[PDB]
Motif scaffolding. Structure first.
Motif, PDB file in Angstrom:
ATOM      1  N   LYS A 274      -0.922  41.539  25.223  1.00  0.00           N
ATOM      2  CA  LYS A 274       0.395  40.957  24.981  1.00  0.00           C
ATOM      3  C   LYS A 274       0.892  41.251  23.577  1.00  0.00           C
ATOM      4  O   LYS A 274       2.078  41.516  23.375  1.00  0.00           O
TER       5      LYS A 274
ATOM      6  N   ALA B  67       2.153  44.750  23.623  1.00  0.00           N
ATOM      7  CA  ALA B  67       3.468  44.819  24.256  1.00  0.00           C
ATOM      8  C   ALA B  67       4.561  44.335  23.322  1.00  0.00           C
ATOM      9  O   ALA B  67       5.652  44.917  23.268  1.00  0.00           O
TER      10      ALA B  67
ATOM     11  N   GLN C  88       7.687  46.681  21.892  1.00  0.00           N
ATOM     12  CA  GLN C  88       9.094  46.320  22.013  1.00  0.00           C
ATOM     13  C   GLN C  88       9.727  46.113  20.647  1.00  0.00           C
ATOM     14  O   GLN C  88      10.934  46.299  20.489  1.00  0.00           O
TER      15      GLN C  88
END
Lengths: 576, 133, 161
Positions: free
Chosen positions: C73, C76, C80
């Protein structure tokens, strides 16, 4: 696999064929190949399949409408919409018509008729047979509709006793018993049917799935086993499948195994789940492999062919999995090369040596890259799965043919090959071979090489060292031990396995330019530390008093604020 | 062949048998059997077969008989004998050993025994499956 | 731990078998095709023993480069933030909540206990996946017991790892 962008691409292709206002055969072929790639890429739920069927039917594609509806009804089991659409397509046909439409009628009767949302199919079938002059056939389908639990069974029953003015209740007791039975069935069914319809609505959640509701309804269809469930649980499970889930298929296959239905049904559900489920699940699919292994003994020919097709598909989709090849070789030697103890030993030996020959020519053809497409093994064999074919060859030569020199010759040969050098079953077999002979020279050379030349998992190396310690202590004496020790290596078979237990790169045999020094307190972060070059803190004060102390020499004062970091995670992974 | 008798010495073998005889109160039964298996010679295999395998057979200790690892270690004792030929050891395992286990114990023994069979006897894997169903 | 330079022939269970004995592992994952993997230990001590122990060891003919990495996570979130180039801020991985008395760090358990909790013994441990189980005297049997299993079974081919 941008499926929404594919839906927009298909929509713009259909809209550009429709807004070019002609046939647009280039755009028609583009839209059709797009829908072909969309069906071959994604599930083809009933809306896009129905749209492609409508566009194709308007393009006069009757036979191609029959085929795409066939693979569409393959890819929607509750598709009474596509069945009814198919029935309309079935209604208008040529010479084979009255059979082929009724064949599809009995097909939709097999595929969708047991659900409460199937009433338009039986109504359309009644309309088709009422268009025919076969009043007995319409009454036979009517006798079928009275015995099924649907929503509007009462309207159907009143229409049955009003349409049949000529023969309404020739068998009154049976007809009313079926109608009251279906009414009790719909009364019990309406509980979970209403629990479904009071949760099922597309709201982008588990309520869109009605997942707890559909699970409880299917679990209700598990317990009430009056065998209509054998038709109805599919009428449950297909209704559960429309909105794939692996635990659903496992529950379904488990209950079909509990009822002991014919094995072609369970194979059919297995092939359906093997097609529809996405990759990397590995759990239903190994269960189908173990299903074939259990049901093999009954048939012995059909299940071998299913098994080989299945394992071939698996080794194509899961090529780094090793267990498929072991299962293939055991089914190979259990089916194709069948011994038994009855036969003469000259016959038993021959099957073993022929197995040795197909193994050895298969590996020798794979190493030289000459794949004989005739032998199915060489089709399967792989640079992950090669070593286990070698291990079967070793294990058969050493244990069955009892031929030690050819075994030792094979270890020397295949020890060097890159594909199988760092291989766990090869070296654990080498360890059992040299363990069954007592000899300690090869075993001590092996557990020396487990760090340097032999690269195995740390768990496997930990096992080899612990078991060889227990073996060495129990099976050898102080004379052999003290001869095993030479102090030029400081190898000793009792203490060296203990010291190298978790250190894979253990060998026993200016210390500030080393990278152990430079990142001593903090791992990964390397810093040159200021230090005094001539440092007297080893010297005692009694000897320091003897002569005057030199001034300090230094090192690396300039670098106390520079620290460097070899950030492999940012570079190799995020920046890719 | 100067095969040093490790656990087959009268001082040590008595300790090993005295711990094997307690059957569930003690802790380390399968490790002890699994190291007693490792002798691989005709004289050594005969002694180990007679003293811990035949004897726990004839005493009828239910802990060892229902346990799959006992039968697996016994088959693996016989199969890795360097003395016996292939037909001899396959004959012994299928014909002499595998009838002796009870059919009530099948649900306990068949996971391990299958794992022997597929590893070494794929041909006889029907026989096993027929013997216990 | 970010392991980089993976050989693309090595699975998650095969890599778990490499990085298992250094500690108890919260999770092991390999990105599809990305030639790198991650191993998340429970302790900092276990992870540093991993990086010191397996550094440049050839896992399937390719030497392996080990370093600190982040999770899934967190990765990720960094990607982004790398597209929008906005902040790229990390946050800190949670700690145990000191003091813990039962736990001896970097110690592993594989599978009716009346423990007296005297200090040399290991009162508490993490279950292999995840739960908290009390170690006993009996567990030194079970590991050895399971060890003989994967010496036998994995020899024939039933686990390559």
């Amino acid at each position: 696999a941008l499926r929404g962008l594919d839906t927009q691409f298909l929509q713009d292709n259909t809209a550009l064929v429709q807004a070019y206002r002609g046939l647009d055969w280039s755009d028609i072929s583009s839209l059709t190949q797009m829908v072909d790639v969309i069906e071959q890429t994604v599930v083809k739920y009933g809306n896009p399949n129905d749209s492609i069927k409508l566009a194709l039917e308007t393009i006069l594609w009757q036979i191609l409408r029959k085929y795409p509806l066939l693979f569409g009804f393959w890819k929607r089991f509750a598709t009474i919409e596509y069945q009814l659409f198919g029935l309309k397509k079935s209604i208008a046909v040529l010479a084979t018509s009255v059979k082929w439409f009724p064949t599809s009628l009995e097909l939709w009767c097999d595929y969708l008729n047991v659900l409460c949302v199937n009433n338009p199919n039986e109504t359309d079938f009644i309309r088709n047979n009422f268009e025919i002059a076969k009043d007995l056939i319409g009454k036979q389908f009517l006798s079928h509709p009275f015995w099924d639990k649907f929503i509007e069974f009462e309207v159907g029953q009143k229409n049955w006793h009003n349409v049949q003015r000529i023969y309404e209740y020739i068998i009154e007791v049976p007809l009313h018993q079926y109608a009251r039975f279906f009414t009790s069935y719909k009364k019990f069914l309406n509980e979970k049917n209403l629990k479904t319809t009071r949760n099922i609505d597309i709201v982008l959640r588990k309520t869109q799935t009605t997942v707890n509701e559909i699970w409880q309804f299917e679990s209700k269809i598990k317990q009430p086993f009056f065998n209509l469930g054998q038709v109805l649980n599919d009428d449950l499970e297909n209704w559960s499948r429309y909105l794939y889930h692996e635990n659903t298929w496992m529950m379904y296959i488990k209950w079909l195994t509990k009822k002991n239905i014919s094995d072609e049904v369970v194979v059919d559900i297995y092939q359906k789940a093997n097609t529809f489920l996405p990759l990397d699940f590995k759990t239903l699919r190994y269960d189908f492999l173990r299903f074939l292994k259990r049901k093999y003994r009954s048939n012995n020919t059909l299940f071998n062919n299913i098994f080989n097709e299945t394992v071939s598909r698996y080794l194509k989709i899961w090529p780094n999995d090793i267990l498929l090849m072991t299962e293939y070789l055991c089914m190979l030697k259990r089916h194709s090369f069948k011994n038994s103890l009855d036969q003469s030993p000259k016959e038993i030996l021959e099957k073993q040596t022929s197995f040795t020959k197909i193994l050895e020519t298969s590996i020798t053809n794979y190493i030289n890259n000459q794949i004989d497409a005739k032998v199915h093994l060489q089709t399967l064999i792989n640079d992950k799965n090669l070593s286990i074919v070698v291990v079967e060859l070793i294990k058969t030569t050493w244990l069955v043919l009892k031929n030690n020199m050819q075994t030792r010759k094979y270890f020397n040969l295949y020890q060097k090959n890159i594909l199988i050098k760092n291989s766990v079953p090869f070296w654990l077999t080498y360890y059992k071979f040299e363990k069954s002979n007592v000899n300690f020279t090869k075993l001590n050379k092996f557990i020396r090489e487990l760090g340097v030349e032999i690269y195995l998992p740390t768990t496997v190396m930990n096992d080899i060292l612990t078991d060889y310690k227990t073996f060495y202590l129990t099976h050898s004496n102080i004379v052999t031990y003290e001869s095993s020790i030479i102090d030029s290596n400081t190898f000793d078979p009792i203490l060296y396995p203990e010291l190298k237990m978790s250190n894979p790169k253990y060998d026993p045999v200016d210390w500030h330019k080393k990278t152990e020094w430079k990142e001593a307190g903090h791992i990964g972060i390397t810093t040159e530390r200021p230090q005094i070059s001539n440092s007297i803190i080893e010297c005692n004060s009694g000897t320091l008093i003897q002569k005057p102390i030199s001034l300090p020499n230094f090192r690396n004062l300039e670098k106390i604020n520079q620290v460097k970091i070899n950030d492999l995670y940012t570079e190799e992974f995020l920046k890719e | 062949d100067s095969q040093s008798n490790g656990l087959l010495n009268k001082e040590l073998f008595d300790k090993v048998w005295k711990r094997l005889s307690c059957k569930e109160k003690k802790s380390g039964q399968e490790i002890l059997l699994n190291n007693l298996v490792q002798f691989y010679s005709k004289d050594t295999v005969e002694f180990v077969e007679k003293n811990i395998f035949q004897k726990i057979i004839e005493f009828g200790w239910e802990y060892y008989l229902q346990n799959g690892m006992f039968w697996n270690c016994y088959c693996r004792l016989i199969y890795f004998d360097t003395s016996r030929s292939y037909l001899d050891k396959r004959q012994y395992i299928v014909r002499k050993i595998w009838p002796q286990i009870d059919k009530k114990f099948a649900q306990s023994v068949l996971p391990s025994l299958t794992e022997f069979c597929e590893s070494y006897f794929p041909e006889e894997m029907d026989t096993l499956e027929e013997m216990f169903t | 731990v970010f392991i980089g330079g993976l050989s693309s022939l090595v699975t998650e269970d095969e890599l778990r078998a490499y990085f298992q004995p250094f500690g108890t592992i919260v999770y092991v994952k390999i990105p599809v095709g990305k030639c790198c993997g991650f191993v998340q230990y429970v302790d900092r001590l276990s992870a540093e023993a991993a990086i010191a122990g397996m550094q440049g060891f050839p896992i399937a003919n390719s030497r392996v480069r080990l370093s600190w990495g982040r999770s899934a996570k967190q990765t990720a979130l960094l990607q982004q933030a790398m597209l929008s180039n906005s902040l790229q801020v990390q946050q800190q991985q949670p700690g145990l909540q000191q003091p813990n008395y039962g736990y001896i760090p970097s110690s592993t358990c594989e599978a009716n206990v009346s423990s007296t909790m005297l200090p040399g013994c290991q009162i508490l441990n993490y279950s292999n996946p995840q739960q908290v189980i009390m170690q006993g005297s009996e567990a030194v049997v079970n590991s050895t017991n399971a060890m003989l299993n994967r010496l036998e079974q994995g020899s024939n081919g039933f686990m390559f790892a």
